[PDB]
């Protein structure tokens, strides 16, 4: 169940007799009230119709009108929210409607609210799929990160949200709500870890977080490998990234065995660069505070595990979090260094700011021992991905078409979308080095793709895919600056489908 | 008395019978010789008039004509200096005249010179105020910094300067000269500390300098706090600046009790960043050698104390020098770090090159314990101040209008001027952070002001002002590159007035 201060219930009772602090109804733009709103209007003797006739609420998506006590209702307030003029909403409009409702309710002193929104239609979504989107939007919309504020906002009075559904849909709605709550809990852990400042959130801290998660979930086993063990394993490019920082690196291994021992596991590999200065290839100063989000890949592995552990899915899951801090220093890796990866391939490190792939490639080699049926790495890897796909769609590459399709489908269902980019063999020659087996960077052309090509050289032994979340893992500026928790919804949906 | 190799005397004798190696007289452009010059001309039987009639000296400000022995004079040489055609000189012209005189005298083998310049008028300045400007310009014009030159210039022969004044003005001239000499001595210490290279002038060195000043002045008490004590005090942003450098930080506390114990002290807070690389937010290489001047704020607190201690002013004075070195390293503060200042306010360090305010804010909190009647911080804080006000006028902000006015008036009298910039409440929102109580930088707009706004959040408990000397503390290039010693003249004049 959701942990962020909200209980979500599903009930099949009549809205017009439900006791609640706020009853929420949808109002169309220039079309008749839906069945639920009409039943409530009838119960009040036409009071809602009479208000709407006065014209303050045009009915555009997300517009609101709040009424107090109406005759013959047990609702203390009635919140009208506009649903536009279309027969069906798209996902974006449904989310906008839900967020407008939540924003209003947050500011009220009501301890609960009941959503009578079952008459809304959303393109391509039945009861379960609508509940997944609605509850995830509501629950994630409650997220707060204020532990470093001396002045904290007043706690919400709102503590309970009831979804009204016809009895024939209530089981699907309940299922969707339960899954959405687990996803939102995972997103909240991901966002917390992403938002923590890098002087607190370093690799050792992430190791202790993993141990704490195992304390909470007896089904989770955790092992944390330090720099001595990494050197024993021959993890040369991983160590090269870490060596310039005072902070020691960590390889965190999470294991959950929800299925029979004969089922091959799915492996999630997360880039956990807790801060990325670029190293000797130093980044510019402007906006470099957002490099604390360079561990959002690893954070999303935490969050996906958190959701899976709550749902107790019948799957075998492994998490590999490759965490290091990338700092300049008198002992840092230099451009031109050549290192031997755990696979034995030598890499010429042309640019020390292309370091995510250097911790990932050793983790991908490590993943071979699990004989996985799928391996997915998640990383804030290339600014080129933002040029290619922006901030709303993650880049996706892989060496197996069926797995890539499974991830695309999961992202569509989750409304946490990705988009495939090709790993054509012609791109690989961009990584040729006169000195070593591989150069760690290509040119300025096709940067997201050549990063995927680099990783692919370590993933040939299994079905593998790669999510570039450089654009989707956080919001850069404004009031809403901070980690997003993506791609936890995509990944959790992928695993939900693999668990059937 | 001035310590840089010059004795300054005031005498009321007739210039035309004074024994001296060089007698200095002013000559107007196209107006009759003044009273003193005319008396000397008469004594020579018209020899000076006869030379001037030949036309080599037009009389423009600072032009010179040097004569040898003239009939009936006891002066071995007579130096004529042009004073222009105006009835009164401005401060700039008076300084230019004085510097031209000094430049000539420096090149002569005369052991002394007598200045018969009492007939010069300077706008808004009586005898005391003219003597303040003249002697300070002369004494500071003798400054030399050559300890790293293997080949040193020949020592000056000039060792004594006599100011001739009418008996009715001689007491005021003597007072002005005494104060100007103390100010020039303080400026020389400030300039020395500013000009020292940063591999010599680090925080520990500045601590030893403070101890040495207490050895020289029994009225001064000094305490030097190291990093352990700073951590005990909770000085988190100060420590964050220092942590990347091998050089430990120092908080230097100077105390002078020249008044009764019931008089609240005045506190000077100086930024002593002995070198500023920018840290992880690294500066460009061009001109970064001038970042050794990033401790000129603290240096000016040294210099102001040096002048006050010589004058034995009846005031209670405290100096707080917050000194650290700002270096990149594997343990340096990272953009995005959040730290807790000694006040308890949390700060998100968006840019590690805005570090002066991070050592200053903890020092401003520390200053509360003295129950001060005024607190002035001095810092080379923002390049934006140079854009706003250039290299000749310091920026001034504060939370108390009377104190700001007192400092402006002192700067006008000293001809070491400042100019107020507003700390309107509307600017404060530029420092909002989604994560912490304060961000350490605003945007690119109003950078000098938002830095002052940041400091103001730590100064609410007392009357406070802030001098941005990024433009006035040093000269960037050319033959005269080096520290200026400003704002020691402004600060010392402020304290002279507070001592009445
Ligand atoms: Cl159904
Ligand atoms: Cl750990
Ligand atoms: Cl360790
Ligand atoms: Cl976009
Ligand atoms: Cl799916
Ligand atoms: Cl007088
Ligand atoms: Cl010291
Ligand atoms: Cl020390
Ligand atoms: Cl200027
Ligand atoms: Cl004054
Ligand atoms: Na619509
Ligand atoms: Na839509
Ligand atoms: Na990087
Ligand atoms: Na990175
Ligand atoms: Na290229
Ligand atoms: Na003139
Ligand atoms: Na002038
Ligand atoms: Na700086
Ligand atoms: Na500085
Ligand atoms: Na700005």
Author numbering:
A (entry chain A), B (entry chain A): 17 to 516
Paper text:
The apo enzyme occupied the metal binding sites, with likely Na+ ions present in the purification buffer. PaPepA did not copurify with Zn2+ if metal was absent from the purification buffer, according to crystal structures and fluorescence data. RMSD between apo and bestatin-bound PaPepA is 0.21 Å, and the RMSD between the apo structure and Mn2+ bound PaPepA is 0.21 Å. Major features of the protein structure are identical in all three crystal forms.
Intracellular leucine aminopeptidases (PepA) are metalloproteases from the family M17. These enzymes catalyze peptide bond cleavage, removing N-terminal residues from peptide and protein substrates, with consequences for protein homeostasis and quality control. Here, we dissected the catalytic and chemical mechanisms of PaPepA: a leucine aminopeptidase from Pseudomonas aeruginosa. Solved structures reveal the presence of a PaPepA hexamer, which displays high similarity with E. coli, bovine lens, and P. putida PepA hexamers (RMSD between 0.4 and 0.5 in comparison to PaPepA).
